[PDB]
């Protein structure tokens, strides 16, 4: 257990990437809370492999494994939270796209930080849909919708606002099947946040730039929209420009 903290410390002494430092300590803090030796070895093992690779992208994927296990590895775990970490480790192993591996791992980690049965149900059903597909654009979008849907339930959205977001998830999954562009799919991620936050929305189109201006957002809300869009565009491969001005958020595609 104490050795786990050492490997994480011996990692930041040679690394600088904020994720590598952070995930090293998050996996160590979540270790003590779950004193089941199975967890105390997977984290330790994932740390020793992270000490043996200059590939930082590989390091993060190895540390997200330890954090995902130790979050549900705590005895205070329901069935859904355990089922999400399973599909997220399966769906990540089968794919060779580092985006999908990082996406499915970070989507579950943010999802397992919420005891909300509706959010855990939607994610699990979303993972079971991406695990049952092959079109990687559908998977890179399903993981983006689930991670953004979890960030709303973790932030403390209303039970009515969440159901207005779960419908967008259905819209986001079905529209990608027909073959929606990466940009029209990210625009659905933007709508899920807006509708999930109960704020205004104005859609304008200039050439091939779909400017989206959102108002009435608080800083606690402008950070959830920022962290989600930066995650969705990371998977979908879309150059987005997000502008702020106090109480206004302007997203351009």
């Amino acid at each position: 257990k104490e050795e786990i903290k050492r490997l994480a410390e011996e990692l930041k002494e040679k690394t600088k990437n904020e994720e590598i430092k952070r995930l090293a300590e998050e996996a160590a803090e979540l270790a003590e809370r779950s004193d089941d030796p199975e967890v105390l070895e997977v984290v330790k093992k994932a740390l020793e492999e992270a000490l043996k690779s200059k590939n930082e992208e590989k390091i993060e994927l190895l540390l997200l494994v330890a954090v995902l296990v130790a979050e549900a590895g705590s005895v205070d775990a329901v069935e859904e939270k355990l089922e999400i970490a399973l599909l997220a480790l399966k769906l990540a192993e089968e794919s060779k796209d580092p985006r999908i591996i990082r996406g499915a791992l970070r989507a579950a980690i943010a999802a397992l930080r919420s005891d909300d049965p509706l959010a855990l149900k939607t994610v699990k059903e979303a993972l079971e849909r991406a695990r049952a597909s092959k079109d990687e654009r559908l998977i890179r979008a399903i993981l983006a919708a689930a991670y953004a849907f979890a960030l709303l339930a973790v932030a403390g959205a209303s039970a009515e606002r969440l159901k207005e977001a779960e419908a967008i998830v259905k819209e986001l999954i079905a529209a990608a099947e027909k073959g929606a562009s990466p940009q029209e799919l990210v625009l659905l991620v933007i709508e899920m946040m807006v509708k999930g936050m109960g704020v205004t929305m104005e859609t304008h189109r200039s050439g091939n730039e779909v400017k989206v201006v959102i108002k009435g957002l608080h800083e606690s809300q402008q950070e959830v929209l920022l962290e989600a869009v930066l995650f969705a565009a990371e998977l979908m491969g879309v150059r987005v420009r997000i502008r702020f001005k106090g109480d206004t958020v302007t997203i351009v595609v």
Binding site: A77, A85, E93
Partner: peptide, 23 residues
């Protein structure tokens, strides 16, 4: 009936961490 999946989660990571070092 739930911890049945908790073992598979660990084993799904065991191979995911190990077999990636078959090189």
């Amino acid at each position: 009936r739930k911890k049945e999946l908790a073992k598979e989660v660990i084993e799904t990571a065991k191979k995911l961490i190990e077999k990636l070092a078959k090189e």
